[PDB]
Amino acid sequence: ENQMRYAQTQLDKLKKTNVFNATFHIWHSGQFGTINNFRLGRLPSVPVEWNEINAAWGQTVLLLHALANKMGLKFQRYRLVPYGNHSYLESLTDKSKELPLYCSKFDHAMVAFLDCVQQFKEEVEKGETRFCLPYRMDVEKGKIEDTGGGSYSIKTQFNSEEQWTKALKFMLTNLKWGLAWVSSQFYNK
Amino acid sequence: DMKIRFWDLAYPERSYVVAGSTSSPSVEGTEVVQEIQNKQTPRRGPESLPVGHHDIITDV
Amino acid sequence: ENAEWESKPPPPGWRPKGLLVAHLHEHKSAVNRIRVSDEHSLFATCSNDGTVKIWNSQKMETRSILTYS
Amino acid sequence: QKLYSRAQRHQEKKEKIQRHNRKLGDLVEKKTIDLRSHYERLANLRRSHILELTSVIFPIEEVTSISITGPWISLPNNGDYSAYYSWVEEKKTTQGPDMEQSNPAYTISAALCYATQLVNILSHILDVNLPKKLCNSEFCGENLSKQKFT
């Protein structure tokens, strides 16, 4: 009975956790957003290493890539190149130049990432009319804005890390709801 | 119950469950040590694997 | 007058922390007894599978160093 | 007369316990068949879940080298990482520029990173207690020193 009840417990925890929810977990702590316990962005009061931010991107890039790859979505403007420490993007229309998401350039990569998020969002919104995202995105400006009316920039140049880290948390919070939607369409099938 | 208990016969208030972290619910003229379970979401890191046994422990 | 309870008692103020060192499953079914050699160099566990397995205490940084069936 | 009743009642107890023993063995027999079904349901769910995990997030493919998540990240099949070690020990003594993204110190770190994540996900899915406690951050951060890397 103990062995049977244990196996039953394993079955229940697997059914409650789709492959994506098992591979990636998303939460937050203050202004920090975290994927797989890697903080994205840094508080001005904390000397967070760029290495951690690079690792957090390596997860976020794989997450957004894999979500599209499972859903069958093919990107229209950029190809995500996931690296655990040096993620970057390759444009489908321009492979002569590139800009990486890792730091130690930079700014065109961050907006190009939001471009992938926008393309993903459009495909998810083409799903069910009931899906929305709590934070707005303007890839043309490179900004993220809250609704529940503040505005912040994902471009870190000519800005400060406090306004930037919040925007990263906001963006990750959107990906949270995106992942939940993807899982809601495959966890029971 | 597959929970290893360390019992301190000199200071029983210091007795504790060895086969588990704090994820588990914490706890006639005869000196009886009584264990009463305490009357006790944010993903503060991933959930670890249960390290303890999952079936009746037979010996120590 | 001088019968020692243990050949090697626990260290002073020993408090088992609960750190798993080795997870072993070389037995097909229920283990019935665990006994440690009085040298503490080896220990043995017997099982309902009809086998007994002997283990090297020092190798618990793992393998049934010996087996009998 | 007290013994005649005892012989009777002890014999009834022998019959009752023998009947009870029979039903327990049959119950355990039946419960084992169900436990077998549970373990197979779990094995099938785990394997399907794992096949999805690799086909969607961690594709593993061979081209000699083997790659994970795609061909841009790969490691040599013979596991002769002495090339990376040499670049590590050479760079630690005579630092050089990371002129290209294909640099060994980049791709190799990414491979070990996703590998360590995959084994941890597999560990959870398979419910296998790993012998060496390891986490993905071990391959993130600064370029590992000879000691900690080995």
Set of chain A residues whose Cβ sits within 8 Å of the Cβ of B2:
2
**Number of residues that make up chain B:** 60
Task: Look at B46 and A6 and tell me if their CB atoms are within 8 Å.
Answer: no
Task: Look at A2 and B46 and tell me if their CB atoms are within 8 Å.
Answer: no
Question: Taking the C-alpha atoms of A102, A104, D113 and D53 in order, what is their torsion angle to the nearest 10 degrees?
Answer: -20
Experimental method: cryo-EM
């009840």: which residue's tokens? A5
Residue C3 token pair: 């019968």
Set of chain D residues whose Cβ sits within 8 Å of the Cβ of B51:
129
For residue D111, give the nearest of D148, D139, D144 by alpha carbon.
Answer: D139
Q: How many CB atoms lie within 10 A of CB A186?
A: 13
Does B58 reach chain C within 8 Å, measured CB to CB?
A: yes
Give the 3-state secondary structure of residue B12.
Answer: helix
For residue D11, give the nearest of D3, D22, D25 by alpha carbon.
Answer: D3
Q: How many CB atoms lie within 10 A of CB A45?
A: 9
Distance CA D25, CA D2 (A): 34
* Resolution limit, Å: 3.2
Write phi, then psi, for A153 (nearest 5 degrees).
-105, 135
Residue type, D91: K
Distance CA A42, CA A50 (A): 9
* Continuous H helices in chain D: 2-56, 82-93, 104-126, 146-149
Q: How many CB atoms lie within 10 A of CB D84?
A: 20
For residue D117, give the nearest of D143, D94, D137, D88 by alpha carbon.
Answer: D137
For residue A119, give the nearest of A145, A146, A89, A94 by alpha carbon.
Answer: A89
Set of chain B residues whose Cβ sits within 8 Å of the Cβ of C16:
4, 6, 18
Distance CA A64, CA A82 (A): 10
Distance CA A60, CA A65 (A): 8
Locate the chain D residue with the closest alpha carbon to B45: D135
DSSP, res A89: E
Compute and round to an integer the Cα radius of gyration of chain C: 14
Q: Are A61 and A104 in contact (CB under 8 A)?
A: no
If 0-12 CB within 10 Å is exposed, 13-18 middle and 19+ buried, where does residue D1 land? exposed
Chain B: closest CA distance from residue C44 (Å) = 12
Does B47 reach chain A within 8 Å, measured CB to CB?
A: no
Compute and round to an integer the Cα radius of gyration of chain D: 29
CA angle at A44 for the pair A38 and A49, rounded to the nearest 5°:
40
Set of chain B residues whose Cβ sits within 8 Å of the Cβ of D129:
49, 51
Residue D79 token pair: 């596991």
Compute and round to an integer the Cα radius of gyration of chain A: 17
Q: Which helix (H) or strand (E) holds D132?
A: none
